[PDB]
Symmetry: C3
Subunit: 159 residues, 3 copies
């Protein structure tokens, strides 16, 4: 049915260190049992303009029905693109809990999304005690603004 | 019509060195002329728990109608996800024989799917005298269990 | 509706240094707000068989309706795969102008599509004053034929 969920927002819609300090643009498109994801995060305010830490994480938790729970992402921006309705009950976009069991250690590695200077990215699925989750991690360069390159990722969905 | 073929199995469904020594989870999703593939292979028994060789291949051969022929993968696990019927006559999931002519040498390279330690992966299409095929190759670390990271790949399908 | 645009051609359909000196096979498939692209370019004549430069670009410009404008690609080969009609008015395949504003500097990096020897690839969206565009760039090895490995890329489309 509905193919696309995204978090597009012209204004800040993500809170990492303080309220609305970042823009998060995550887009998920479903093609059968696969979702193709792209994620772009832009640091806009505070330490995100001059990093102290050398890594940053973002967790998006969902209930067992596929609803986004309170987290760093402004929920009002998490919408079905086609209808512009909030992305409620998106079970068939959730990472498959048989393929990615809750709290299973992910294969020990990550992805280079840039070189010179190097930036790494990883996504871990269902690191959560109930429901579903995405946990994203990026490297960061201390003293510099946080704005990693876009990352692409693919996973198997719940049926 | 049908969008997804996969080989999901809770039990071993692949025979590399001996009967049912591995689990193979290959998932193909069709979006027009492209298929998006993910493949995860887990070594479970025998030398797959303590490798001798430093590379391993898996060939999936198909007839000219898109039916899986006898091979290392348990055919009863190769199913259309949506209907849970065996994946018979999947011609429009086959690697395009104009784009990938039978027995054409593939571009001389491969993909790093892990570093520290390094693991490489490649897929070659239609290395077969009749019909269609996928030939997958992974590096392996001697003395260690075989369980490479998941690989993602994309190809153009038959019409 | 229509899912696939491609430039498949048995004969040369691209003009880099001289008329019809290359074959370009670009395939775009739309899955909601994402397009999955693959691109393969083969140098066939002239300096493309023995390169002088160490990099080569290809720009595909489109009007505001999603029609291909005069460029290096033979327009008669740019077709909807499903109908075999020319790919006219393909607005919903165009790179989103909110996500990729015209003439916005792209994240400063590129992709390795081969090692030993190394080959890099990049795609920049909407580097154009009106309408839409793709600008592709590959490295090349002086003294050798131009035939880089296939590249895969994903972008967000216009609505």
């Amino acid at each position: 049915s509905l193919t696309t969920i995204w978090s597009i927002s012209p204004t800040p819609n993500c809170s990492i260190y303080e309220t609305q300090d970042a823009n998060l643009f995550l887009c998920l498109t479903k093609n059968g049992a696969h979702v193709l994801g792209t994620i772009t995060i832009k640091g806009l305010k505070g330490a995100l303009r001059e990093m102290h830490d050398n890594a940053l994480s973002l967790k998006l938790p969902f209930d067992n029905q596929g609803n986004l729970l309170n987290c760093a992402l402004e929920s009002s921006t998490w919408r079905y693109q086609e209808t512009n309705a909030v992305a409620s009950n998106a079970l068939t976009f959730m990472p498959n809990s048989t393929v990615y069991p809750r709290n299973k250690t992910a294969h020990p590695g990550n992805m280079l999304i840039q070189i010179s200077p190097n930036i790494t990215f990883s996504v871990v699925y269902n690191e959560i005690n109930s429901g579903y989750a995405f946990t994203f991690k990026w490297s960061a360069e201390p003293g510099k603004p946080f704005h990693p390159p876009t990352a692409v990722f693919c996973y198997i969905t719940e049926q």
